[PDB]
Amino acid sequence: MQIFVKTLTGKTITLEVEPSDTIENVKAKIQDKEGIPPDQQRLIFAGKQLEDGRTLSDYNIQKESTLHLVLRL
């Protein structure tokens, strides 16, 4: 399946993922497509920040869902 990751700036990114993927797996996929260090990444889904070590399904994130990327920087 596939989801969208949206920075605050506006830039959108499409990711191909499995519901089994951990938040770390996803932060890693972003570091690839956008060279950001996963320690700088804070992912947010429907107002909740995604906690490390849990999976997309644990959050009921389904195909075409939208996460926002915030940064610690």
Binding site: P19, T22, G53, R54, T55, S57, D58, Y59, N60, Q62
Partner: protein, 33 residues
């Protein structure tokens, strides 16, 4: 569009292949037999 975690008052969503647990509750289950 799925189903909550089989365990007590768990905030997360389970999955059939995890006998209905979220990922970490499932590991907890597995670790206890």
């Amino acid at each position: 569009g799925t189903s909550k975690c089989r365990k007590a008052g768990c905030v997360y969503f389970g999955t059939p292949e995890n006998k209905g647990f979220c990922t970490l509750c499932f590991i907890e289950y597995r670790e206890n037999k």
